[PDB]
Amino acid sequence: NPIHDRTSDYHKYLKVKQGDSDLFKLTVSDKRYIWYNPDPKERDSYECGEIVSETSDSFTFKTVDQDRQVKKDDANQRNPIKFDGVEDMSELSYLNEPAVFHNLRVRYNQDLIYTYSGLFLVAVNPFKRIPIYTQEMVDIFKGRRRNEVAPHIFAISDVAYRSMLDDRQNQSLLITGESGAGKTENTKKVIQYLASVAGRVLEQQILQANPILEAFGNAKTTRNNNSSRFGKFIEIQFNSAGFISGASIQSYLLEKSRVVFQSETERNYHIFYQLLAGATAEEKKALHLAGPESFNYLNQSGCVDIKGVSDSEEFKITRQAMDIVGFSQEEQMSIFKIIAGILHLGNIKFEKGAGEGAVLKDKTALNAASTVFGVNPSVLEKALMEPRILAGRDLVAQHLNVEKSSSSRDALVKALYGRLFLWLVKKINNVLCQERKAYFIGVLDISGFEIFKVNSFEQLCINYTNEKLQQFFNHHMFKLEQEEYLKEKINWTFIDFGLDSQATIDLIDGRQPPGILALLDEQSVFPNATDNTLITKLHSHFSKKNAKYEEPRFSKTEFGVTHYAGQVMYEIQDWLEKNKDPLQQDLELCFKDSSDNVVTKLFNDPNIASRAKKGANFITVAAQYKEQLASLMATLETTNPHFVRCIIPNNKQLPAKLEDKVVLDQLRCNGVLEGIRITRKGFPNRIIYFVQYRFGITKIFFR
Numbered sequence: 001n002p003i004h005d006r007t008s009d010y011h012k013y014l015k016v017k018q019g020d021s022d023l024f025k026l027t028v029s030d031k032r033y034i035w036y037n038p039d040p041k042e043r044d045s046y047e048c049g050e051i052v053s054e055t056s057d058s059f060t061f062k063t064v065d066q067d068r069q070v071k072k073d074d075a076n077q078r079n080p081i082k083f084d085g086v087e088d089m090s091e092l093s094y095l096n097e098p099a100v101f102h103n104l105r106v107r108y109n110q111d112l113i114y115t116y117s118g119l120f121l122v123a124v125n126p127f128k129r130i131p132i133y134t135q136e137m138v139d140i141f142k143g144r145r146r147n148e149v150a151p152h153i154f155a156i157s158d159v160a161y162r163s164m165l166d167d168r169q170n171q172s173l174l175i176t177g178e179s180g181a182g183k184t185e186n187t188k189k190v191i192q193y194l195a196s197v198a199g200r201v202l203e204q205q206i207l208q209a210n211p212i213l214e215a216f217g218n219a220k221t222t223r224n225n226n227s228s229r230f231g232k233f234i235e236i237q238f239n240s241a242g243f244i245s246g247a248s249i250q251s252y253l254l255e256k257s258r259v260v261f262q263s264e265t266e267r268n269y270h271i272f273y274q275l276l277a278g279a280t281a282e283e284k285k286a287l288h289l290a291g292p293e294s295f296n297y298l299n300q301s302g303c304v305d306i307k308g309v310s311d312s313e314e315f316k317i318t319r320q321a322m323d324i325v326g327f328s329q330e331e332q333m334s335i336f337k338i339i340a341g342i343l344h345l346g347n348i349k350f351e352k353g354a355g356e357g358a359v360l361k362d363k364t365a366l367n368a369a370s371t372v373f374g375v376n377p378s379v380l381e382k383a384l385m386e387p388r389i390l391a392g393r394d395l396v397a398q399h400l401n402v403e404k405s406s407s408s409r410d411a412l413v414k415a416l417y418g419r420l421f422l423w424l425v426k427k428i429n430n431v432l433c434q435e436r437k438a439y440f441i442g443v444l445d446i447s448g449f450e451i452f453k454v455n456s457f458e459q460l461c462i463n464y465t466n467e468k469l470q471q472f473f474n475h476h477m478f479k480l481e482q483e484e485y486l487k488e489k490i491n492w493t494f495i496d497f498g499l500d501s502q503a504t505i506d507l508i509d510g511r512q513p514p515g516i517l518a519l520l521d522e523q524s525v526f527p528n529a530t531d532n533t534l535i536t537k538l539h540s541h542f543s544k545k546n547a548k549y550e551e552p553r554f555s556k557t558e559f560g561v562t563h564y565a566g567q568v569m570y571e572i573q574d575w576l577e578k579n580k581d582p583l584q585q586d587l588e589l590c591f592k593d594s595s596d597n598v599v600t601k602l603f604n605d606p607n608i609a610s611r612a613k614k615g616a617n618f619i620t621v622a623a624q625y626k627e628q629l630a631s632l633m634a635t636l637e638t639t640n641p642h643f644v645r646c647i648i649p650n651n652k653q654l655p656a657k658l659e660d661k662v663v664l665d666q667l668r669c670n671g672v673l674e675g676i677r678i679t680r681k682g683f684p685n686r687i688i689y690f691v692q693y694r695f696g697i698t699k700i701f702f703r
């Protein structure tokens with residue numbers, strides 16, 4: 001049994017190493033220690049000091065260099081060192097910030113990235129490979145109760161699975177974290193585990209969905225070389241017997257804007273670089289492709305390569321995945337034509353004509369785009385610079401200037417890419433949709449909390465999703481738990497754990513008074529609105545009124561929201577246009593006539609191409625965002641949730657470098673310590689009257 005065998009890989013990579021005789025001596029010491037700040041302005045940088053004396057209300061301790069004194073009520077005592085490396089931190093004698101961090105630190109220094117914190121799992125990103133995800137590791141975890149085996153994403157996955165069978169109830173695994181923390185990697189481990197333990201081709205197709213979704217939906221940002229720029233909820237589906245019977249991917253809004261613009265050091269989506277690096281000799285000839293430096297949508301950020309990644313090798317993995325899932329050869333070629341066409345569209349350079357209207361003097365890129373898409377270039381040209389619209393009921397050809405022509409071309413590009421993404425997902429699901437499910441375990445992998453030099457509408461939506469997810473944790477851990485105690489009169493005094501995201505949520509998405517998103521939508525159907533009337537409207541409603549909002553004095557185009565994870569300043573530029581997400585009808589008419597079988601689906605299939613109405617306007621991006629979020633939250637309310645809190649060690653994407661201030665900020669806003677305390681102070685288990693404990697109006701409660 002590898003669990004009891006100290007030579008096994010399990011012991012070597014999942015268990016704390018045996019301490020030596022010098023450590024034992026230290027472990028049986030009578031000395032006592034405190035965690036203190038050498039500099040009181042740096043409250044997250046701690047050292048260990050020996051307590052050398054006490055009064056009834058104070059401790060005196062030695063610093064690393066001088067004696068100091070602290071009130072016992074302000075003291076962060078160090079746990080006895082026998083607790084260092086403990087698998088479940090609810091066991092600590094002293095529950096405080098430096099002590100929790102220290103325990104994570106002891107584990108992380110030994111490459112033990114997983115630790116329990118009461119009822120939920122903490123996962124600290126290693127930023128290197130650790131050999132704990134093999135089939136042999138999978139086999140050790142199968143069927144084991146949580147307390148029987150070391151902390152691992154596989155263990156929580158198995159717990160959910162056994163709960164699904166024993167309770168005949170759908171489960172969810174909610175993996176939180178800021179950008180780069182490890183959500184996507186852990187998600188993939190859950191799916192790997194479930195597919196193995198509940199498995200019977202289908203299982204391979206489930207796994208091979210991922211390189212396809214990542215190639216099209218992930219990119220390098222300044223926070224993560226493999227950032228997910230769309231959120232997803234993966235339902236792994238099981239029959240009544242508990243075997244895997246299929247899977248369904250709900251994807252959420254994609255950051256389409258990245259197709260046409262990337263900040264310094266970032267990349268566009270991986271697929272672009274994969275194609276250009278990986279394509280056949282005259283694949284590149286048939287698609288009129290050169291290197292990335294030749295394309296406006298790839299040559300602006302200054303970064304075309306990611307350290308440690310071969311885009312040519314990745315392209316081969318993407319294509320192998322498309323084969324397994326079952327995209328035909330013609331389909332793959334059409335997918336790649338669309339990618340190449342987008343790059344050509346980006347190279348179109350509009351210029352000022354005789355008047356205010358734009359012209360196209362060089363039609364090389366236009367012609368190359370048109371060829372690969374199978375559309376008529378003259379029609380495309382007219383649709384870009386002279387689109388027809390209604391003025392009342394009259395049909396009037398516009399003549400767009402350079403900036404509008406360029407923005408229209410960008411709109412077409414973003415629509416092509418976002419529809420293609422949707423089509424990939426729909427094609428994947430149709431293959432994985434083979435049996436009506438009896439049960440599901442859903443795994444949620446959103447885009448994580450993120451802050452850049454410039455934060456836009458996408459960032460607000462991402463960060464709001466994260467705030468909502470933290471609120472869901474808070475609701476399940478603290479609010480529902482104490483509501484149960486109190487309805488069942490078990491002698492409980494309500495505790496205010498001080499984590500309530502409601503104010504921030506209401507600021508962003510309130511209905512009365514209207515929040516940010518509601519005011520955005522109102523401005524978006526107001527004919528005279530501009531980005532400046534928008535920001536003026538937000539300040540008018542929130543400045544000096546809402547405690548989570550800030551009108552900054554240093555800018556007239558930004559506003560601040562205090563999120564759980566910190567304040568973010570958002571730049572209002574282009575919000576109205578991003579929210580309305582327009583595309584000229586004449587561009588649609590152009591592409592509806594495509595000779596390509598995939599392009600034509602993107603423009604004629606109503607599930608991909610049609611856009612809902614509300615009254616006389618198309619649904620905004622904000623309303624679409626809200627529908628998707630409300631849909632997720634409704635599904636989650638029908639599941640039994642399990643939480644994994646992914647923690648990023650630093651902001652450099654480096655191994656072996658656990659940064660104090662970075663980690664402690666996360667432990668705090670995640671509610672980790674509060675979560676451990678409710679587990680310790682409360683009563684996790686209860687049963688209708690069955691035929692350190694308590695008696696409810698209808699149930700016995702215990703621990």
Ligand SMILES: Nc1ncnc2c1ncn2[C@@H]1O[C@H](COP(=O)(O)OP(=O)(O)O)[C@@H](O)[C@H]1O
Binds near residue numbers: 130177448
């Ligand atoms: N458990 C893991 N083992 C090895 N590397 C990991 C692990 N978790 C995260 N990483 C590394 O961190 C990167 C970012 O993690 P990811 O899961 O993509 O973050 P996100 O939370 O933004 O989805 C990964 O590409 C990988 O390099």
Ligand SMILES: Cc1ccc2c(c1)C(=O)[C@]1(O)CCN(c3ccccc3)C1=N2
Binds near residue numbers: 462
């Ligand atoms: C549940 C949910 C609902 C909407 C979402 C998300 C998740 C995301 O993670 C994103 O898919 C990540 C990017 N994003 C987005 C992109 C552009 C505009 C608005 C939101 C997101 N919207």
Ligand code: VO4
Binds near residue numbers: 177224228229
């Ligand atoms: O960088 V992550 O968007 O995948 O949170």
Ligand SMILES: [Mg+2]
Binds near residue numbers: 183226445
């Ligand atoms: Mg991710």
Ligand SMILES: [Mg+2]
Binds near residue numbers: 453
């Ligand atoms: Mg700024």
